[PDB]
Structures are given as structure tokens and as C-alpha cells.
Amino acid sequence: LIPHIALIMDGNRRWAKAKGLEVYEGHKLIIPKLKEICDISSKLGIQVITAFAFSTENWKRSKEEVDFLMQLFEEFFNEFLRFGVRVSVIGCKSNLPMTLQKCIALTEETTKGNKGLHLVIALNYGGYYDILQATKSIVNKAMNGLLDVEDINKNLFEQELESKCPNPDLLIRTGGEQRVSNFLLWQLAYTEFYFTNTLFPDFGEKDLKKAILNFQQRHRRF
Amino acid sequence: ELHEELIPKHIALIMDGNRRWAKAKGLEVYEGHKLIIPKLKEICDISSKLGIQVITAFAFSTENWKRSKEEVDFLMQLFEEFFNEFLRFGVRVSVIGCKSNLPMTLQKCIALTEETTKGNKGLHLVIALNYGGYYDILQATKSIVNKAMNGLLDVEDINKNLFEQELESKCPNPDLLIRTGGEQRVSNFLLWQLAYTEFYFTNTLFPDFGEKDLKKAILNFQQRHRRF
């Protein structure tokens, strides 16, 4: 009974403020924390992790914070070039700075043959966005004579979505909020929801093992 | 005590626990199912008094067809009795889900209750019957494809606003989802519409879920609003 885990990595701001640091000090930990969580998850046999790095609503933050995050994401993709996990990105890439677009493309191509755990970064992603782009794609295929309206079913639709099957078995959200905040809407239809007040920079091996134990107990119960 | 200004305007309800409740009570399986009618009357009355404006209740999922034909036939007769009972109850009633797959008498009972209550002025009760989140997104997609193929739509106009016009569960979306029975998942209920909804899970079984349990859920929603 080991879970695909979807991860909403909330609590970085609160963690830094409680410690007396600037806001960016918690964001900055996305790189060592995801390396830490990839190592633990590979040992337990996970398979896929999808991490919500930047929502389509995150553009409404200050330009200084958004500019920091975009530079941080560039450093992230550079650091995962030789880390050994397979890396993919979902989200609208054409709205990102060009250097980030090319770093994403390089890391996706460089790591595409890495074996084992697949880390999916949702960057400029939202559930609405994913469903709408799948809808537009399906409309375009119908208008070009490539599909019939009657062929539009769950199988066809899930092939057009950016987050692919197998869908998450378990969603973990740190930071205490009990909502999904426009993450993987279609893909969460049967996912187990696990919410913890633990802040993301404090989320470690013992916290992940607790979430998996809770997932296993719930599976036996229902 | 609740703050009047922080009452959720739309609550989505997954009504789980009827079978386990009947088993624990020494009753047959159908005894729990039958309570949908008095239970939803009771929750409608409580919700009207607290100022809730919309309740969407998950009565029959697209996966519920996998139960025995005897159980499905019983439920279909129960739903017909439900809509007859709500003809004169005084709330506005709407149904979302695939109606063409339902028995014809039930299709026409649904249609009559929707038409008869469409001018009722308070709480709006939406019954999700032969409904799923996948179904809603797929039928919206098929509708948009059909309009495009019939020359009625410029593809550059396909956006969130257009998509929301085609979905069956409409804005405003649920502020709060309550699921009884202890499971912590949404089980293919209102997928698009739950993007920002607060999730509240309780071990209380649905036939036991009453005024105090609903007030507890609302009180919890308000505290989350203060916190975040």
C-alpha cells in the first residue's frame, strides 16, 4: 500500500517570518527540500511527485517577489540537471522569461532518460488552465476532422491534460489550509487528501512517513 | 454562536454513511437510503435559518450504476418520491446530471419539480443525480465542440467564462464542502467547482448529521477564514 503524491508546498513565508528571516529565505529552500523529498520518496518506492511551484494566480504578488521566484526556478532547473531524477514541467511556459523557458527545455531533455522517480513541477499552472487547454485542443482536432464528438470521453480527455495518469493517490498540503487552490482539479477526483499544519521547510522524512501511514490506515478502513 | 457575515453562501454535501448507519442500527440497507427525504428537509430548514443560499447534494453518482439493479431500481423510485415531496416544500429545486439515462417517469417528475419551484424565493437546493465531475467537464466540452462545428463559435472566444456557462453546476461555486462518514476524498463530485472550496470531513454518519453538526462545520469554516 505505497502511493503518485501531489504536493502543495505552503508555509514558506510563515516559516521565515517566525524565524526572523526575510521572505525569500523560505522560498529558497525549495531546492534542498525537493532534493530531500525525492531521496526519501525513491527509498519508499513512490514513483511520481507533482509539486505546485507557481500558480497562475501567483503573478498577482509583488514584481520583486515574482522576479525572485523566476530566478529561483532557473536555479532549480540548473541544479536538477545532474541530480538523477526525471524532471517534467506542466503549465503555460510561453509567459515565462526566455532564459527560464530554455532552462526548462534543457532539463526536460537532459533528464528524460533518468530511471525511477519522476518529478513533475507545476509552474504557471492551474486546474482551470489545464482543463481549458485540453478543451481547446479537442475543439481544434474536431474542426480539422481528426475526431468525433462521440469519441470525447474520459480516456480521450485525460490524454489531452498536462498532468497524466496515473493520477495522484495522495495529496499532501503543508501549512494548514484545507483546500486545493486550483491545483490538479480533474486529476484529484479520487485522491486521498492529507492536510498538516507542518510548514513546508519543516516537512521531512518523519512527516512523510506519517502521511503514508495515514494513507494506509484509511485504505484499510474504506 | 456564528458570525452572520461569514456564513458560506453555497455548501456542497456528500451524504455518505447511510449503509453503515443502517447496519449499525440493525436495519436493512434500504432503511438508511429512505431517510434522504426527511434528512434533506431537515437540513434545508436549518440552512434557511442560518442564511445559506445554495446547497448542492450528491444524491447519485455516475458510478452508482455499478450497484445491483435491485438497489438502483429502489433508489430511482425513492428519487421520484423525493421530487413529488418537494413539489410543495417551498425551496427552489434544480437537478444536475445526465437525465436522459433515467427512467422516463423520473425525468418528467424532475422537470415538473424544477418548473414548479423555479420562482420560489429562498434557498436553492441542487440535487446531483446521475452526476459526476468528469461528466460535467465532458458534457461542457462536447457542447463547445458542437457549437464550433456548427459555425456558432469563434475558437478565440473559448475561455473560462464560456466554459462556466456550459457547466451544469453554476457560479457561485461552493464555499464549503461537507462530507459525512469519515472518508477524506471528493469521489468525483464537483471537480471544476471545488477549486477554492474549503473541505470539511466528519466521521458523523449522514443520518446522524443534524443542526449541531452543521453549526460545528460552519463554525469551523469561519475560524479558517479568520486564520487565513
UniProtKB/Swiss-Prot annotation, chain A:
Its cofactor is Mg(2+). It is found in: Plastid, Chloroplast. The active site is at D10. Its main location: plastid. Optimum pH is 8.0-8.5. GO terms for biological process: plastid membrane organization; polyprenol biosynthetic process; response to cold. It catalyses: 3 isopentenyl diphosphate + dimethylallyl diphosphate = nerylneryl diphosphate + 3 diphosphate; isopentenyl diphosphate + dimethylallyl diphosphate = neryl diphosphate + diphosphate; neryl diphosphate + isopentenyl diphosphate = (2Z,6Z)-farnesyl diphosphate + diphosphate; (2Z,6Z)-farnesyl diphosphate + isopentenyl diphosphate = nerylneryl diphosphate + diphosphate. Expressed in stems. Expressed in petiolules. Expressed at low levels in leaf trichomes, old leaf and roots. GO terms for molecular function: dimethylallylcistransferase activity; magnesium ion binding; prenyltransferase activity. It comes from the Eukaryota. GO terms for cellular component: chloroplast; chloroplast stroma. Uses dimethylallyl diphosphate and isopentenyl diphosphate to catalyze the cis-prenyl chain elongation and produce the 20 carbon product nerylneryl diphosphate. This is Nerylneryl diphosphate synthase CPT2, chloroplastic. The chain holds residues 87 to 309 of 314 of the full protein.
